[PDB]
Every structure is written in C-alpha cells, then in structure tokens.
Amino acid sequence: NMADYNTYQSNVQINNLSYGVYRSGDKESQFFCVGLKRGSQVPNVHTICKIDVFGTHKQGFDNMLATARYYYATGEDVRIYYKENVWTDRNFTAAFSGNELIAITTCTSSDYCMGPTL
Amino acid sequence: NMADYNTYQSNVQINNLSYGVYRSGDKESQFFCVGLKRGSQVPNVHTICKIDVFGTHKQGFDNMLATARYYYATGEDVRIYYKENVWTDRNFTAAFSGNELIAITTCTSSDYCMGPTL
Amino acid sequence: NMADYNTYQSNVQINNLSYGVYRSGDKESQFFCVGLKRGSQVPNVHTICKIDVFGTHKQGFDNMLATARYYYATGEDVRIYYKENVWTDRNFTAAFSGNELIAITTCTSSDYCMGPTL
Amino acid sequence: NMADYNTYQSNVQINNLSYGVYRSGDKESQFFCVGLKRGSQVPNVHTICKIDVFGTHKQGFDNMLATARYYYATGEDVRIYYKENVWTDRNFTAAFSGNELIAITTCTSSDYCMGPTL
Amino acid sequence: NMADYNTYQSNVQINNLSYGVYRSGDKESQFFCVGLKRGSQVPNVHTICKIDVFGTHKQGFDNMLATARYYYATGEDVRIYYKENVWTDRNFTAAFSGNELIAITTCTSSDYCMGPTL
Ligand SMILES: [Ca+2]
Ligand SMILES: [Ca+2]
Ligand SMILES: [Ca+2]
Ligand SMILES: [Ca+2]
Ligand SMILES: [Cl-]
Ligand SMILES: [Cl-]
Ligand SMILES: [Cl-]
Ligand SMILES: [Cl-]
Ligand SMILES: [Cl-]
Ligand SMILES: [Cl-]
Secondary structure, three states, rough: OOOOOOOEEEEEEEEEEEEEEEEOOOEEEEEEEEEEEEOOOOOOEEEEEOOOOOOOOOOOOOHHHHHHHHOOOHHEEEEEEEEOOOOOOOHHHHHHOOOEEEEEOOOOOOOOOOOOOO | OOOOOOOOOEEEEEEEEEEEEEOOEEEEEEEEEEEEOEEOOOOOOEEEEEEEEOOOOOOOOHHHHHHHHHHHHHHHOOEEEEOOOOOHHHHHHHHOOOOOEEEEEEEEEEEEEEEEEE | OOOOOOEEEEEEEEEEEEEEEEEEEEEEEEEEEEEEEEEEEOOOEEEEEEEEOOOOOOOOOOHHHHHHHHHHHHHHOOOEEEEOOOOOOOHHHHOOOEEEEEEEEEEEEOOOOOOOOO | OOOOOEEEEEEEEEEEEEEEEEEOOOEEEEEEEEEEEEEEEEEOOOOEEEEEEOOOOOHHHHHHHHHHHHHHHHOOEEEEEEEOOOOOOHHHHOOOOOOOOEEEEEEEEEOOOOOOOO | OOOOOOOOOEEEEEEEEEEEEEEEEEEEEEHHHHHHHEEEEOOOOOOEEEOOOEEEOOOOOOHHHHHHHHHHHOOOOEEEEOOOOOOOOOHHHHHHHOEEEEEEEEEEEEOOOOOOOO
C-alpha cells in the first residue's frame, strides 16, 4: 500500500475554507484548512490542514491550495486522504485540528473515488 | 489562542480591491488592500492590507492576493482576521489603513465562519 | 517523429482527477493522475500520471496540472499523449498506474485533434 | 502623499490587453499594456504598460498582469494609477506608450474609488 | 519599428491548444502551441508555438501560456504576433510548425486590434 494513504474520507464536500499566515515556533508559516460535510452530515474528521513549512510532507503547498479552492468552488464530491495527529501547536489544533492534508481525488459514485482503497 | 487571530470581522463581503507597487522608505514593495462591507453597513475596520516586504508576516503575499481576489469575485460572506496599527508609513495609512491582513475564512451561515472565535 | 509522442488516446475526456503528496523511495514527491473516458466508455488504458521529481520528463509539473484541471472542468474532447510502464513504485502503480503524462491537446472534430499522429 | 500615486484616472474600464516578449536595447523583456475606455469615450491617456526588467518599479509584474487580466474580464470601473513618459524605447512608445502602470483599484461609484485621492 | 513585430494575423481565434513536455537535443523542454482559425476559414499560418528553453525569446513562457489559455477559453478575436522559421527541430515542425509566438493582443472591432501595424 501507499504509505500515508490508509486514512481517508470518501464522498465528502469541501464546504468551508480557511487560508492564513501565522507564526508557530520560530517559523513564519502559511496554512490552509478545509472544512468537510457529507451531504447534510458533518463527518467525524471534518477539518484538515496543510502548512507550508511544517508537516509530514511539506511539498505541494500551492498546488494543494489551488486544488482545494477549486473543489470548494465546485462543491463536488471528493475523497480526502489525511494523516491524524500531526500538528503539535496546541493553539493551532484547538482552533483547527491536528490533521494533515495528504491528497484529494474526485468521486463519480458512492465509494469508488479515484485512488487507493482499503 | 492563536497569536494575531484575536481581531476579526465575521460575515463581511469584500467589496473593493486595491493592488499596486510602491516604494516605502527605501524599499520597493508590492501591496494589496481589501475594502469591506457588511450588507449595507460598513464594519468598524473596513480597509485591510498586505505588503510583500513589510509587516508582521511577509509570507503568503501571492496566495493571500489570489484568495482575496476570489472572494471579491464571488462576493460571498467571509471572516477577515487582521492586525491593527501595523503600518508606520503615514502616507500609506492615510491612503489605506494601518491594518494588516492575517487570514480569510468562509462562512456557512450568519452564525458560523471557519476559524477560532473569542 | 517526436520522441515519446507515439502513444496517445484521441477524443477522450478527463473525467477524474487525483492530486497528492507522497514519499516514494527516498524522495518526497507530488503527483497527479487523470482518469479518462471516451463518452460512456472507459478505454483500456485510462489512468495517466505525472510526478514532480520522477519520470522521463520532470519539467512542466505545474503547467501540466493546470492544463489537466482546465480540461477536467470543461470536460471537452482532448488527445492525451503518454508513456507506458514508467513508474517502478509498485504501491503507486497498483493504486494508480505506470503511465506517464506527456502532453494534452484539444480536438476540433471526431477526426482531428491537434498534435502529431501515427 | 504616496509617491508615484498622484497621477490616475478614475472610473475607466480596461477594454484591451496586450502581452508580449521583446528585446529592448540589450535586454530580453516581457511587457503588457492595458487599453482604456471611459464608457463610450477614450481618455487622453489610454494606454498604460508594465515591463518586467525596466521601469520605476520592476517588482510585481506577474501580480499586476493577473490583476489587469481580471479587470479586462469583468470590464468593471477601476481607477488606474500610472507614471507618464517613463519608457525610453521609441519603437515601443510609438507602438504602445511611455506610461508605466503603478496600481489598479476598484470603484463603487463615480465618487468613490479605493486608494489615495486628490 | 519593434523588432519581431512585423509579422502578425489580426482578428483570428485560438480554436485549439497543445501543451507538452519534450526532449530536444540535451534540453528537457516544455512547449505549447495555439491553433488558429478565422471564422470558418483556416489562415495560411495556423500553428504558432512557444518553447521554454529554446527560441528568439525564452522569457515569458508561463505568462504567454496563461494568456493563450485565456483567449482559447473566451474564443475572442485576437491578433497574434509571431516569427517564422525559428524551430530547427524538423520532427517538431512536422508535428506543429516552425513559428514562434511573440505576442497576443485583443481586438475591439474588425478594424482594431491593439499593438503596432504595418
Ligand atoms: Ca457560504
Ligand atoms: Ca474542441
Ligand atoms: Ca462583467
Ligand atoms: Ca465596482
Ligand atoms: Cl476534525
Ligand atoms: Cl479602516
Ligand atoms: Cl490504466
Ligand atoms: Cl497620496
Ligand atoms: Cl496613451
Ligand atoms: Cl502553420
């Protein structure tokens, strides 16, 4: 299996977006977070973030932001891959979450979506 | 609390946009500013700016600009996080404001915008 | 003939998209994959990927991504040029494919897409 | 007042756009120009340009281009700040103009545009 | 006159787009090409290309691509400035053309496009 691709939520929509700049530790950072819904429900893990100078995978900040904003704009069904309990800044996690955004793929029906499944 | 996230206006719309180049002191800079409305109302702080080579957070000029431009285009409800009394160039503050743009988040209703609240 | 331009699918549509970050071997990478259809049909080779730090051609990651995203949005008829059996990470190829994305061109009719043909 | 912000036209529209590459003297450059209208009229100064490797302010080429292209698309009322008779290449000024683009801001009415005013 | 601005097609439409990666000599390159129509007719010169690491003007690849994609999206009347017989890769010219894209400008009517004329 593809490392860090075993945790995901399928057929969700990105219905909120946060983008901001923020100092954490000794690093000046950028971050964004997606807020998730699944139809009228709010999924268990519903806030996922990516930070430019922190994380399991620091590459792809701009591309991941553009991708998320695009799906925010369309409101289409997606699968979000993420990694839990990454962020150590307790102020950041309380306001948002500890989840790191790993990947986003598109969905054509219930439980297909592009990408690896368990 | 997340430092610099304690000051914000919720459920506003970005109804004006400025982008320009400008020399301040001896430094060549870029800046943009968002102008705010709240329905027919004008919020306490209504002009917020970001500058590429100045400010409490220099990172993220391009992403913040594209993000602001997007919300200007849709005119949707957003929350604006900002920092007061930042800019020391009195020519700039008189023309725009002393406010530095920190973050922009989306709103799902008149009771929910993404991000930390007081 | 143009090297790497001898394998392609004409008049297909991009109907799915994946973007992600991933450690492959000893490298931190970004990737995306397009999923292809031909009307209601799914061609035998239907998944094509590009990776920023791996492949026969590492250049053009951002531009190819933006290009792929535009055509996903319009859903218009395109020709996809690709190279088979490139990726050696069996975790990746099993979840996605071994195909490398080389070029995308638009189509004017059922008989004509821009670019070189066999 | 903000240096280089004393010359502008309020409530004009960008109704034409030029982007190109060009060798000027011994330098390889990019440039773009906006062409202006004011309703059904053409203002006295109606062509304003920005060049990547020349000018009073070389910074912000890509951001200014994107900014201008957006207003070209919306055709909305803007205020254009510019500096006259900057470019010295007479082939260029004859084809386009000698004006350097400094800033673009939006207008809510014929009595309000964002930015410093006289 | 502006060197390399003496050859152009006025009031054409970009009706096709090619983007790709390709090795030429010892250079890994990106290229794109626009395909041109003039209403229902196909103009004498109908394929014009720009290559990131080759040409009379290597600068402005991303910006020229963005510009071309924009006019492809709108299908609007443009003027294309180009240079003939530039590419020496005969496999490339056979697939596309020997034409280098120099500039693209907009047209407000059937007798006016922005930029210098003969
Ligand atoms: Ca909303
Ligand atoms: Ca087509
Ligand atoms: Ca409009
Ligand atoms: Ca307006
Ligand atoms: Cl959560
Ligand atoms: Cl204010
Ligand atoms: Cl496949
Ligand atoms: Cl002023
Ligand atoms: Cl003029
Ligand atoms: Cl041709």
